[PDB]
Amino acid sequence: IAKINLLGGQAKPGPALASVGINMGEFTKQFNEKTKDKQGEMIPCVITAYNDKSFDFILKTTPVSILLKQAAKLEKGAKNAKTIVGKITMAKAKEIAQYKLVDLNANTVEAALKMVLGTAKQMGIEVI
Amino acid sequence: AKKDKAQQVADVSHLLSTSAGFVIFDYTSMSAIEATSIRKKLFKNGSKIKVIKNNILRRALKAGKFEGIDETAIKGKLAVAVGVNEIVETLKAVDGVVKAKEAMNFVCGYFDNRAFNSADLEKIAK
Amino acid sequence: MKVRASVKPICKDCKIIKRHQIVRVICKTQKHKQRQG
Amino acid sequence: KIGNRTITLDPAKVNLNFQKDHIAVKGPLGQIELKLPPNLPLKFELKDNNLQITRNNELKQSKIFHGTYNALITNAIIGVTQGFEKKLRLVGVGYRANVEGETLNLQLGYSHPIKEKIPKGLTVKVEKNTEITISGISKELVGQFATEVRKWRKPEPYKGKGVLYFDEVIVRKAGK
Amino acid sequence: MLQPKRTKYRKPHNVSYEGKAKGNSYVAFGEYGLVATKGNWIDARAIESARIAISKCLGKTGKMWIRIFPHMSKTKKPLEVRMGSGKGNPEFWVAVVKQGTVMFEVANIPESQMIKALTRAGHKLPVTWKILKREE
Amino acid sequence: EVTVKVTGYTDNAKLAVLKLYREIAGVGLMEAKTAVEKLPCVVKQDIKPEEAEELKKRFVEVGATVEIK
Amino acid sequence: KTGANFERSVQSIQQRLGVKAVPIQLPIGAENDFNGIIDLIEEKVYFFDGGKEEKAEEKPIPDQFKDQVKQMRAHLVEEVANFDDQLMADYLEGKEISIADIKRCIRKGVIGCQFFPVLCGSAFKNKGIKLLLDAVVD
RNA sequence: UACUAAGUGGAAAAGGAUGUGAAAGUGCUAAAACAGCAAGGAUGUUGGCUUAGAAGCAGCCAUCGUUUAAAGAGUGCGUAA
């Protein structure tokens, strides 16, 4: 089993996903209409390796590992944590942590904020 | 060391005494993903999920004023769902998990200290 | 099965055996094994 | 450890007698014979439902004896009560085998006929032309016999064609 | 490569490396060090090979110090000549080390890469090297 | 999950309903015809509601009694 | 030839291409025991010749493979069931369709590229090519 | 009284080694320590340069956090990632 994260504009791209045993048009249409509200953006998908493989695919909300750049109003995710790239208000960071609290091992907003700080460590900008 | 072992035995024994409900169940190929799923099912719930040392477990249930002195805290990956404080939600969730898989290995314990079979538990909780 | 004069474990498996009182270095791969190294 | 390795005895039919050079093990699967080396500082005492061996001195080689003779006794017991077997998968195109009497002859890659003799206590059976089962009487005999069978041809990293032991895997090498 | 400035005499005694450490008899500037278990002579080429080995395995930082500087020089008598016409022709410079002499010290990128670099340095010289750590 | 099962046919179009059972996933003539010859036969399972909705749409466009969840 | 597995070919054709190729005739033997063909349109035809085809041995269809025919038979007419409704009515009735009728149906299918027949044989053994010529003419 | 396993003795080293034996220590454990085994060995997360992708892990640069008893931007093998 592998992890995948691709554009939400269309599920047609991806030959590895179509070769699992699921019809191309099937997941293409299904994903494109399940993201019809908001598409044309990067979304992380998850699927399993099943034998029948009719449809065992689901999506997840927008990844938050370098997504703080969206909150930081900048791009070009830094390789090294040597200098800071910008500032993010703590209110937005905590609101996003709560927004992703249910997803992960974090059980309170504080633990999700700790994980946000941990993934922001590499970026060079911390929870400020 | 063993002094810390005894101190933790006393602490968990007191916790078991004040939280009269506690049930221990083991399950095969305990995977991390399913452990996370069941733990998230008990969201904001006092019950703890782990595996503790068999020696410290048997010492704790010896000093815990609980049913048995050393009976089943051996021979298997001793999954422990330490029921803490309110254990009705915990009882229902762990029993639903028991029925979810093929069969969960009933190790020991009860919902408030007075052992009855799990078939009786699933019906009294209802 | 190489011949050297200074054996040092290159791969994960570079074990030795003094088999029949003769030292052979063996590896899980057929290349990293040695002889009288 | 193995210096402390208890071997349980089943006196139902498996009975052991000691000659200090010949240990005979009677059981349902015929009889096992162990050639005890001469002048051993190790006493192999049989008792009720258990077998205990102990050195009468303190020597480096005595510990190796303690491990090895315990291992031999365990192998003898398990062989005389259950035996051993191997499954061989002969992966080939025209490769196949068939037995006449005690001579297993082969259809393999040589233009020359292939024949091999089958030792006693090693019962071979060829269900399909490309699969073989070899139920041996001892792990030594069956292992050595399987090595003799495979020594003719072995699978290659470029292509797997030969006598696989049904538990091994190959790697892929580029064949241009 | 590393030679003195001026030589009042170019022709000293042949050389003897006997004796114990007289100067630089210890490590006094690094954190790890290398000691020679036998008195030998280290010429310019081997010294530079060791130095470039240390430089390559040093990474980006790392502090290194040699306890000596190549001072002595050697002479080569002409080949295919009969016995006795003077002394030899001046040749390469060289440094003398005595039995039990600490020659080299390292710091900056600690003991793991320190020992790796020390082995890299010592694998270029005939001396049976010995690794030590400077104690504070 | 929501599935759809075909009940008693309409127009008695054995050929047409056989083609309908074929178009689901590209199944062959033999298995599809054997499935059609049995009046109760599941078309497909483990599918999202939308594609099952189009499946039922074809089934009611052709004409037959339809059983769904 | 070694590696010439009938199942391998009849599965690989559909896996790589999926052209609905219909295997008509069944061989007798696997690369060493190759000794004839189990004809679908007619009765079995044994070929003892290991080369230089001269005679074809007409034999009844082997008993152990009658069902092997029937299933494919129950498919073959079914495979040409995409041409007319009366053929489907006969299939529902179970009534056999004339061999000439189904032969012409397969002819229309192959000329129209609806499907394509598959036959078996060995060039180095020269078995069953007369059947190929008969099919080509028909 | 200790050593030998090489006929060392009975020629040589750069070198390397769970070779043997002894000594000086340093920790845990009979509750059963360690080896092996039955397993798990997880998430934010496919962090970014970039290989007409950075994705755990060609490499390079950072080189954290959450639950857990356990999990390291991972320990490595290995894959086009």
Curated annotation (Swiss-Prot), chain A:
**Swiss-Prot/TrEMBL keywords:** Methylation, Ribonucleoprotein, Ribosomal protein, RNA-binding, rRNA-binding
Q: Which InterPro entries does the record match to this protein? A: Ribosomal_uL11 (IPR000911), Ribosomal_uL11_bac-typ (IPR006519), Ribosomal_uL11_C (IPR020783), Ribosomal_uL11_C_sf (IPR036769), Ribosomal_uL11_CS (IPR020785), Ribosomal_uL11_N (IPR020784), Ribosomal_uL11_N_sf (IPR036796)
Q: Which organism's genome codes for this protein?
A: Mycoplasma pneumoniae (strain ATCC 29342 / M129 / Subtype 1)
Q: How does it assemble?
A: Part of the ribosomal stalk of the 50S ribosomal subunit. Interacts with L10 and the large rRNA to form the base of the stalk. L10 forms an elongated spine to which L12 dimers bind in a sequential fashion forming a multimeric L10(L12)X complex.
Recorded hits in SUPFAM superfamilies, A to Z, give:
Ribosomal L11/L12e N-terminal domain, Ribosomal protein L11, C-terminal domain
What does the UniProt record tell us about how this protein is modified after translation?
Answer: One or more lysine residues are methylated.
Q: Name one GO molecular function term.
A: large ribosomal subunit rRNA binding
The identity of this protein, by name, is Large ribosomal subunit protein uL11
Q: Tell me the GO BP annotations in alphabetical order.
A: translation
GO annotation, cellular component aspect: cytosolic large ribosomal subunit
| Task performed by this protein | Forms part of the ribosomal stalk which helps the ribosome interact with GTP-bound translation factors.
Q: Provide the family line.
A: Belongs to the universal ribosomal protein uL11 family.
In the UniProt record, the gene name given for this protein reads rplK
- Report the SS bond pairs: none
UniProtKB/Swiss-Prot annotation, chain B:
What molecular function does GO assign, one term? structural constituent of ribosome
- Keyword set, alphabetical order: Ribonucleoprotein, Ribosomal protein, RNA-binding, rRNA-binding
Q: Give the UniProt record's GO annotations in the biological process aspect.
A: translation
The record's Gene Ontology cellular component field reads: large ribosomal subunit
Q: Which family does it belong to?
A: Belongs to the universal ribosomal protein uL10 family.
Q: How does this chain assemble?
A: Part of the ribosomal stalk of the 50S ribosomal subunit. The N-terminus interacts with L11 and the large rRNA to form the base of the stalk. The C-terminus forms an elongated spine to which L12 dimers bind in a sequential fashion forming a multimeric L10(L12)X complex.
The UniProt function text for this chain reads: Forms part of the ribosomal stalk, playing a central role in the interaction of the ribosome with GTP-bound translation factors.
Report the protein name in the record: Large ribosomal subunit protein uL10
Name the lineage.
Answer: Bacteria, Bacillati, Mycoplasmatota, Mycoplasmoidales, Mycoplasmoidaceae
Curated annotation (Swiss-Prot), chain C:
Top-level lineage group: Bacteria
One Gene Ontology CC term in the entry: ribosome
Asked if the keyword Ribosomal protein belongs to this entry, the reply reads: yes
Recite the UniProt keywords alphabetically: Ribonucleoprotein, Ribosomal protein
Q: Does the keyword Ribonucleoprotein apply?
A: yes
What terms describe the molecular function in GO for this protein?
structural constituent of ribosome
Quote the SUPFAM superfamilies the UniProt record gives: Ribosomal protein L36
* GO annotation (BP), single: translation
Q: Which Pfam families match?
A: Ribosomal_L36 (PF00444)
Query: What family does the entry list?
Result: Belongs to the bacterial ribosomal protein bL36 family.
Q: Which HAMAP family match?
A: Ribosomal_bL36 (MF_00251)
**Protein name in the entry:** Large ribosomal subunit protein bL36
Native organism: Mycoplasma pneumoniae (strain ATCC 29342 / M129 / Subtype 1)
Swiss-Prot record, chain G:
Keywords, A to Z?
Cytoplasm, Elongation factor, GTP-binding, Nucleotide-binding, Protein biosynthesis
Q: Which domain of life is it from?
A: Bacteria
- A single BP term in Gene Ontology: ribosome disassembly
One term of GO molecular function: translation elongation factor activity
Q: Does the keyword Manganese apply?
A: no
Subcellular location(s): the record lists: Cytoplasm
Q: Does this UniProt record's set of keywords contain DNA damage? A: no
Question: An example Gene Ontology cellular component term from the record?
Answer: cytoplasm
Biological role: Catalyzes the GTP-dependent ribosomal translocation step during translation elongation. During this step, the ribosome changes from the pre-translocational (PRE) to the post-translocational (POST) state as the newly formed A-site-bound peptidyl-tRNA and P-site-bound deacylated tRNA move to the P and E sites, respectively. Catalyzes the coordinated movement of the two tRNA molecules, the mRNA and conformational changes in the ribosome.
Q: Into which family does the record put it?
A: Belongs to the TRAFAC class translation factor GTPase superfamily. Classic translation factor GTPase family. EF-G/EF-2 subfamily.
Protein's name according to its UniProt entry: Elongation factor G
> Which species?
Mycoplasma pneumoniae (strain ATCC 29342 / M129 / Subtype 1)
